[PDB]
């Protein structure tokens, strides 16, 4: 058990950090990309290339 | 002696492959199938190399392209090989005829 215990302790550290640093909206790949394009993430790529 | 005939670029892709594979270095590897097909590919490459020379017959040339000089009375291109230095001036790059 190598890749499972590491995942467990990583999830534990992540959860500890989340409740330390803290009506949440839904999330999906179909919405974050059009949100990033709405705020203009296309222009950053097309000017950085 | 001095006459040189101009030419276009000549692609050497399968010809160099055949010259590399036809010289037995250490293994002396020969093949009735691989070497025969390689020789056929080199011959076809030479034929399609020649068939575009007649296509590019009247065409001006600008400074910046490859020009491939050909000796007329010898039918022999003049080449510059990177490995071999000149015989007389021993810091140079020798020219030959191939």
């Amino acid at each position: 058990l190598r890749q499972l215990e590491d995942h467990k302790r990583g999830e534990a550290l992540r959860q500890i950090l989340v409740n330390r640093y803290y009506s949440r909206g839904e999330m999906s790949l179909a919405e974050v990309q059009c949100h990033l394009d709405k705020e203009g993430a296309s222009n950053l790529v097309i000017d950085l290339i | 002696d001095c006459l040189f005939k101009l030419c276009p670029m000549n692609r050497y892709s399968a010809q160099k492959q055949f010259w590399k594979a036809a010289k037995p270095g250490a293994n002396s590897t020969t093949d009735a199938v691989l070497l025969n097909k390689l020789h056929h590919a080199a011959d076809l490459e030479k034929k399609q190399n020649e068939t575009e020379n007649r296509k590019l017959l009247g065409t001006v040339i600008q400074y910046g392209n490859v020009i491939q000089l050909l000796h007329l009375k010898s039918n022999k291109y003049l080449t510059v090989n990177k490995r071999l230095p000149a015989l007389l001036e021993k810091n140079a790059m020798r020219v030959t005829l191939d």
Partner: protein, 694 residues
């Protein structure tokens, strides 16, 4: 006026090259090794000043809660400039600037239009010192790490096991990094607030600080990997000149065009003098003590200089540096295989020239066995066509004498590597001689002048003097090819009579050792009898020359070497008593006994060693009647990098969560959040991202 740099200067807190003198002490942030700052002559002149800035900032956090732009900032800028300049000169303990920053962070979070430049500069200075405080807790954390490592290692020390150490690394990793209950949660809030702003260059520093707060474990692991370069507990300057010369080297590799050029030759001379490290000594207690110390990463720096960015290969300023750099690189790998195998991955740079860059391959392969036995089908076969088409190089021809040829008998599997060039070379570079080789060639070599005529460049005969390469590769014990080698060979029995026509000592030595290696090879040789009756004649007229040279009263050196070389022939396979090989008759037994005793007499009478005298007596008589912490730190950094997998989960997930967090009880008000959360935080983030390319 008070920071005029007369007694002091700015010192970075992340300094390297720790010692054994302060790490046995396990104390918290209250005390350090220096226990403060400089001596008691200057601290009292600033002690009454230090409380002033603290009282002023404690008043600022009291009654400047909304903001101030009414010339109070026209004093806070000067007081934080004074604070910043006193931080950089190291007049603080860690217990003081922590108190400064635990209240300094609270003065900003009490919440494209143009604004005031003055507060922009104030915020730039304070984020600069917030950038500094993260660079001093790194040194504390590294110090505590090797302190607890030393105390746990010496608790279970087996020297004047490691399993007890491994159960604590995860414990301290989960204790001192997380799992608490060091600004806290409000540290990131002011970072986000400063990031969401107008377009300064301040936001670049704030965002770099935000990325510096995260990704903390991998960077402390990398720093801890880099800082372990322990020395013999002095380090007064020993690493310092190497480091400042490397930094001097950093400015003379990319572009040499000319103030920078005049430094290169001097610094290469200095680096070579430091690298040779008293070669006339035992080369163990002085060379190896400092040999690992420039193996900190100073390997490819010289190679980047050697990567020839400039191509002016005429007679110019190339030769003033390249020969010296080559010599320094030869001194870099003359110690052992640790540097040799490390440089063995860069064998693609020294292929074509054969003049100056061939000395690297010439000298790097002295006596290794497990590195030069792994030669592929491309390295030694690169030089098969480089022997031709470039002349015969005397300097190069000693290289393949070392990589492949022999130490006695080297190996059998590389005989196909070294012998297949003879049939691949259609030019047949290995010729014997022409018909005029008697005096038209050999009268100029050493019959004219001695001392190798300014370092052995004749271009003609040493290419045939180095035929011991051809002689002993398969003639030791290999039964690979006997007919193939002997067919193109100079046909040994024929070439004897042109040797006796005119004798030359070096060519004679090469001929006798070639013949000795040929005869003692195998017992499956087909022809022996006419090789045995004719070697008697050369043995007789060579013992005549040995007796002639024996009259010299220790006034020669070639004869002694010749006698030693001929000693093995006497000690080689015994003679035969068949129809041929006449059994040492009157004409044969009268020269192999009486004249051999005198040969050994001169050596015994002279200062010659008895190592070769004994074989002559036995053969002549017989023939008549007939500091463990270096591995420990590597083990520790390996065990520390073993836990990198949960770090990715603990890092990337919290990053993508806090970038999905612009608004969650930030002050949870209304006026400061509808600008904050409108899909515009990432908008300003990527707007600043495209402006940082310049």
């Amino acid at each position: 006026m008070h920071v005029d740099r007369d007694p002091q200067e700015q010192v970075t807190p992340v300094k390297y090259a720790r010692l054994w003198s302060e790490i046995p002490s396990e104390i918290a942030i209250d005390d350090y090794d220096s226990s403060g700052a400089s001596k008691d002559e200057i601290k009292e002149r600033f002690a009454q000043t230090m409380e002033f800035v603290e009282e002023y900032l404690r008043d600022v956090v009291c009654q400047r809660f909304p903001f101030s732009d009414k010339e109070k900032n026209k004093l806070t800028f000067e007081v934080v400039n004074l604070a910043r300049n006193l931080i950089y000169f190291g007049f603080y303990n860690f217990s003081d600037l922590l108190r400064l920053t635990k209240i300094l962070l609270a003065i900003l979070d009490c919440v494209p239009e143009k604004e005031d430049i003055m507060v922009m500069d104030t915020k730039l200075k304070i984020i600069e010192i917030l950038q500094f405080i993260l660079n001093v807790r790194l040194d504390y954390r590294i110090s505590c790490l090797l302190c607890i490592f030393k105390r746990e290692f010496d608790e279970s020390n087996s020297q004047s096991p490691g399993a007890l150490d491994f159960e604590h690394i995860e414990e301290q990793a989960e204790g001192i990094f997380g799992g608490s209950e060091h600004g806290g949660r409000t540290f990131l809030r002011v970072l986000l607030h400063l990031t969401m702003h107008d377009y300064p260059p301040l936001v670049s520093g704030a965002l770099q600080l935000l990325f510096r707060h995260f990704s903390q474990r991998q960077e402390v692991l990398q720093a801890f990997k880099q800082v372990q370069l322990l020395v013999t507990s002095q380090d007064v300057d020993n690493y310092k000149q190497i480091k400042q010369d490397l930094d001097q080297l950093r400015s003379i590799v990319e572009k040499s065009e000319s103030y920078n050029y005049r430094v290169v030759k001097e610094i290469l001379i200095r680096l070579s003098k430091l690298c040779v490290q008293e070669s006339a000594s035992v080369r163990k207690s002085r060379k190896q003590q400092q040999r690992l110390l420039r193996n900190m990463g100073a390997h490819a720096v010289v190679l980047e200089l050697l990567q020839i960015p400039y191509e002016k290969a005429e007679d110019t300023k190339m030769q003033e540096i390249m020969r010296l750099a080559h010599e320094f690189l030869q001194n870099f790998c003359a110690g052992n295989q640790q540097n040799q195998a490390l440089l063995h991955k860069h064998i693609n740079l020294f292929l074509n020239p054969g003049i100056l860059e061939a000395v690297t391959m010439q000298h790097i392969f002295m006596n290794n066995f497990q590195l030069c036995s792994e030669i592929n089908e491309r390295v030694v076969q690169h030089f098969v066509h480089c022997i031709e088409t470039h002349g015969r190089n005397v300097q190069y021809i000693k290289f393949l004498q070392t990589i492949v040829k022999a130490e006695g008998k080297f190996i059998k599997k590389c005989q196909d590597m070294v012998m297949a060039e003879l049939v691949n070379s259609g030019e047949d570079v290995l010729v014997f001689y022409n018909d005029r080789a008697s005096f038209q060639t050999l009268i100029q070599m050493m019959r004219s002048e001695r001392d190798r005529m300014d370092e052995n460049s004749p271009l003609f005969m040493y290419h045939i003097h180095l035929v011991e390469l051809l002689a002993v590769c398969t003639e030791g014990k290999n039964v690979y090819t006997e007919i193939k080698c002997n067919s193109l060979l100079p046909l040994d029995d024929i070439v004897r009579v042109v040797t006796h026509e005119d004798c030359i000592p070096e060519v004679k030595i090469a001929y006798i050792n070639f013949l000795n290696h040929c005869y003692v090879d195998t017992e499956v040789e087909m022809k022996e009898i006419y090789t045995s009756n004719h070697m008697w004649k050369l043995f007789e007229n060579f013992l005549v020359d040995i007796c002639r040279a024996c009259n010299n009263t220790s006034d020669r050196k070639h004869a002694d070497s010749v006698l030693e070389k001929y000693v093995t022939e006497i000690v080689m396979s015994i003679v035969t008593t068949f129809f041929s090989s006449p059994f040492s008759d009157q004409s044969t037994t009268l020269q192999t006994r009486q004249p051999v005793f005198v040969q050994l007499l001169q050596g015994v009478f002279r200062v010659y060693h008895c190592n070769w005298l004994m074989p002559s007596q036995k053969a002549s008589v017989e023939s008549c009647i007939r500091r463990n912490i270096i591995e420990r730190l590597q083990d520790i950094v390996s065990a520390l990098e073993d836990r990198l997998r949960p770090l990715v989960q603990a890092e990337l997930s919290v990053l993508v969560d806090v970038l999905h967090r612009p608004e969650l009880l930030f002050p949870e008000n209304t006026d400061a959040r509808r600008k904050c959360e409108s899909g515009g935080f990432i908008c300003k983030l990527i707007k600043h991202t495209k402006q940082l390319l310049e």
